[PDB]
Amino acid sequence: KIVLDPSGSMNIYLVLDGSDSIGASNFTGAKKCLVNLIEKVASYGVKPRYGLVTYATYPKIWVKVSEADSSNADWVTKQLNEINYEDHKLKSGTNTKKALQAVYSMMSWWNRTRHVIILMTDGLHNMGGDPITVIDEIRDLLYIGKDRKNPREDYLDVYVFGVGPLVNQVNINALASKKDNEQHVFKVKDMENLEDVFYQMIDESQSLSLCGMVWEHRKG
Amino acid sequence: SCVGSLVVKSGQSEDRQPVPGQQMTLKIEGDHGARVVLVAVDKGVFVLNKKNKLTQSKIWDVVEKADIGCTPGSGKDYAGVFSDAGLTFTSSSGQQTAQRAELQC
Amino acid sequence: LFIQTDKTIYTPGSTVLYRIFTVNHKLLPVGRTVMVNIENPEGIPVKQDSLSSQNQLGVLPLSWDIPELVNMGQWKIRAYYENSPQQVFSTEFEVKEYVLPSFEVIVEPTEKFYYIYNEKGLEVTITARFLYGKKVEGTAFVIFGIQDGEQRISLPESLKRIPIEDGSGEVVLSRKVLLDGVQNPRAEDLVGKSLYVSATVILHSGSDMVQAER
Amino acid sequence: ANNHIRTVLKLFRTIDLDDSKKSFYLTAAKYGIQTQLREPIIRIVGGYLPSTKLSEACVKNMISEVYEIEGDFYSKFSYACEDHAPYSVECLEDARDDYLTQLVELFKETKKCLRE
Amino acid sequence: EDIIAEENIVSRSEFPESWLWNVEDLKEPPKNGISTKLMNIFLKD
Amino acid sequence: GVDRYISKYELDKAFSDRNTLIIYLDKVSHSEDDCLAFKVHQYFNVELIQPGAVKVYAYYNLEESCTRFYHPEKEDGKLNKLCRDELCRCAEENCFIQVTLEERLDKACEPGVDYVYKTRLVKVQLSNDFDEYIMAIEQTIKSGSDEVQVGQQRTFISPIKCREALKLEEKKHYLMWGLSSDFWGEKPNLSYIIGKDTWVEHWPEEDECQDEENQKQCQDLGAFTESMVVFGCPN
Amino acid sequence: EIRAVLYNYRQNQELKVRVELLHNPAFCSLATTKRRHQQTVTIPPKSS
């Protein structure tokens, strides 16, 4: 599902929508689940390069992947609480295209560095168009789907969370990648009991040797 | 007939004709220690073709065809009777049946 | 060896599941090795497998997927024991274009023969019913053909359009039609031949038709 | 009986399964619940004279326990599905058996409390 | 009116030509040499 | 009559449920046309009628079926669709839909619409089953699934029936928007389809805005775009 | 005393049966020429 290894360099990009449709009530839940995810993934001792971008119409850049201190979990997790839902008050758009273009610019330069994208948007977007164009551009940047012998499909894994009251599932499903036997979309009701979504989020291909891990999903 | 006894019947006593998506219980009666295989097919498949379907009659026909004798009793003489019945009778005195060298009579 | 296939017709692109039973001359489960071959109607083996009936009580489940580009006809499954490759056992399915019909059609003549001097003539009873135990309404088509070995001769003047009511109907072939259909008016020459009935049943709705032949 | 049917349909329109889950899985689970916990009880409660009153607490327990049942189904879909491939239609077919079994067990248990 | 809303209706999807490809053992203790086993199957749509 | 036979079941059902009829023909003439005719009435009176089809086949075969579709408005009966070369597309929609300003913003705020273009028609081209309009991109009101690409020539496709409904005029500016189900083809030759799901409205040029009604329309559209570009909409 | 049994062997449908005893001059029950002895009972399905 995800690349999880302290010996490898991974990139995780966090993007938050500033749309007025979601409201602050779900924005707090999104912030809480993002904090839970960063705390959980950082608990394995890995230090991936992070980044935060909050957008409503013009994508504000908070944390850049090129920052030397960006690998610190503490810096990112205390920048998480710094942002608020009321920051994007002048602009109330849902320009997903501009935000993904900003992510493209941030990720503009490597061939062995796994990239992970996680997104939170209700899907209903007024400004911009279909994010598929920027997704295809980013896919072509890493040379994905260009060689019949080296597909390199495990380097770019995009995730989306359907946080919001009125959500259109068609574009949410379209935006998320559809891989073999993997899930990439989730629901608001996952704020409580983050362990359920987290179990899909993190896999142990080689992390079983170490110790200091525990699962709390009620399903088992 | 079967050497054992395999019977399939519905668990529900009378009830009503089963509705699609509704459960039902099958009661299979057979000799202990035997492994049972099952298969269920729509009858349209059979109306469209019903040739070479597996059944007990075919099994017994194959077994009967694979016999060794092909004369319903009696014969020309003792050697002929024994050969037709599908055996060989050899004695220290010298009596013997007719030699057989063909698989199919 | 008893080859059991779940169905008898398989659409292209659909998998086939067949179980191979292994028994001895005393009809008991045996542990041996079974060679399996699948032969297309023109006689070209396509997929060959090796198995062993050890630790399965003489049951060897198997599967195969039919490719999209195949020649429809009479496919064959061939199996034989390792020690006796000459003894080949057979069981044949077929691949065809079909959609499942919604009703059986049974043609049951009153007597399983036709007396040559019977002036009444052959009588055919059509009994069509839905698969799920309900009667059918519609119209039927009957044509009587004379089969002489591999040679089939049709009778254009025996085509009769009978209406089927409550899953029942009847049609009669007058002896004059049988005599005049063949060029030879002789009677004794017809002894030794055979007849067939090609009944087509059509719903009042026109949903589909089923060609049932005896 | 017409008000009772409207009440039962109103209570089953309160079910909200997250659309993020697999499409074919969602259809399979919805079909199972619709054919094993809606049709029988809707037929049962459509045969009451209008004077009789319903006990909506039993239907609320219906909904809570069927949420638990679907959670168990989704858990067996991926986690306990060790023998079969994760998120595979074959694994769904494997787990559909005990899913439907425990659902009909729920319905048989809860039939005795429809009328208060 | 008294009708099922079009969202609630769920269509019968599974239309298999064959099913119940099962192999089970008769381990239930014999009674007069005739064991009995019950399985819970669900009929296809 | 002779040579024709209809079963009694289809003859004794009245107007209730006789939407499908079957006729048995003993023989059909192979030299001339064995033409038969009758009358059909209308009772249920519903709009948007689907075409009805006739079917002919012998009793001994079923793949030798000739099917034809008839419909009073669609000429030869085939459903109105737009196809280019090999790949085709469905076009079973009305040409267009349907003054004040508030409802314009209300409809422009919907999430379905993505691209809003106020362009200039350059040239009009016609084809076998569709018409072509050359768009001169001046500015984009709201960038959609496809960007304006700085502004160049853009092509349109519309059903040939819609040509009689409205005839676009070259060198005439227009205000219009659609959705992501409009652009069709491959880059950079995407063709935007116009139908019921889209909108059409003429914006006369600033010189042509002289008329008082034209003044009102032009000022309303200017206020709309001025609000749209900066104020946006809460979504 | 006398007992009248109102069977009901339908499906899950409920029945609001109304039963009355018509007056007879040869008996002394609650039914008279003017007054009537009516009851409005309910029979659960598959019961008595």
UniProtKB/Swiss-Prot annotation, chain A:
- According to the record, which residues are glycosylated? 26, 32, 111
- Cellular localization per UniProt: Cell surface
Q: Which domain of life is it from?
A: Eukaryota
Residues recorded as binding Mg(2+), renumbered to this chain, are 19, 21, 94
Reaction equations catalysed:
Cleavage of Arg-|-Ser bond in complement component C3 alpha-chain to yield C3a and C3b, and Arg-|-Xaa bond in complement component C5 alpha-chain to yield C5a and C5b
Essential cofactor(s): Mg(2+); Mn(2+)
Query: Per UniProt, where does Mn(2+) bind?
Result: 19, 21, 94
Annotated VWFA domain ranges read 11-202
Q: How does it assemble?
A: Catalytic component of the C3 convertase of the alternative complement pathway, also named C3bBb, composed of complement factor B Bb and complement C3b. Catalytic component of the C5 convertase of the alternative complement pathway, also named C3bBb3b, composed of complement factor B Bb and additional molecules of complement C3b. Interacts to CFP; this interaction contributes to the stabilization of the active C3-convertase enzyme complex.
Described function: Serine protease component of the complement C3 and C5 convertase complexes of the alternative complement pathway. Following cleavage and activation by factor D (CFD), forms the C3 convertase together with complement C3b. As part of the C3 convertase, cleaves and activates C3 into C3a anaphylatoxin and C3b opsonin, the next components of the complement pathways. When an additional complement C3b molecule binds to the C3 convertase, forms the C5 convertase, which cleaves and activates C5 into C5a anaphylatoxin and C5b component of the membrane attack complex.
* Name of the protein: Complement factor B Bb
| UniProt lineage | Eukaryota, Metazoa, Chordata, Craniata, Vertebrata
Curated annotation (Swiss-Prot), chain D:
Kindly state which keywords UniProt assigns to this record, in alphabetical order. Complement system impairing toxin, Disulfide bond, Secreted, Signal, Toxin
Further notes on this entry?
A: The protein is equally effective in normal human and properdin-depleted serum indicating that properdin is not involved in its inhibitory mechanism.
Question: Quaternary structure?
Answer: Associates with activated host C3-convertase complex C3bBb (C3-CFB). Interacts with host properdin (CFP), a regulator of the alternate pathway of complement.
Q: In which broad location class does this protein mainly occur, judging by the first location in its UniProt entry?
A: secreted
Determine if Secreted is one of this entry's keywords: yes
**Record's keyword annotation contains Membrane:** no
Q: Which locations, inside or outside the cell, does it occupy? A: Secreted
Disulphide linkage map? 58-113, 81-91
* One annotated GO molecular function: toxin activity
Q: In which tissues is it expressed?
A: Female salivary gland (at protein level).
Biological role: Salivary protein that potently inhibits the alternative pathway of complement system activation in the host while having no inhibitory effect on the classical or lectin pathways. Binds and stabilizes activated host C3-convertase complex C3bBb (C3-CFB) and inhibits its convertase activity. Enhances accumulation of C3bBb on immobilized properdin.
Quote the cellular component terms of the Gene Ontology held in the record. extracellular region
Shown chain mapped onto the complete sequence: 27 to 142 of 142
Listed name of the protein: gSG7 salivary protein
From Swiss-Prot, chain G:
Q: Which organism is it from?
A: Homo sapiens (Human)
> Taxonomic lineage per UniProt?
Eukaryota, Metazoa, Chordata, Craniata, Vertebrata
Coiled-coil stretches noted in the UniProt entry, renumbered to this chain: none
Protein name (record)? Complement C3c alpha' chain fragment 1
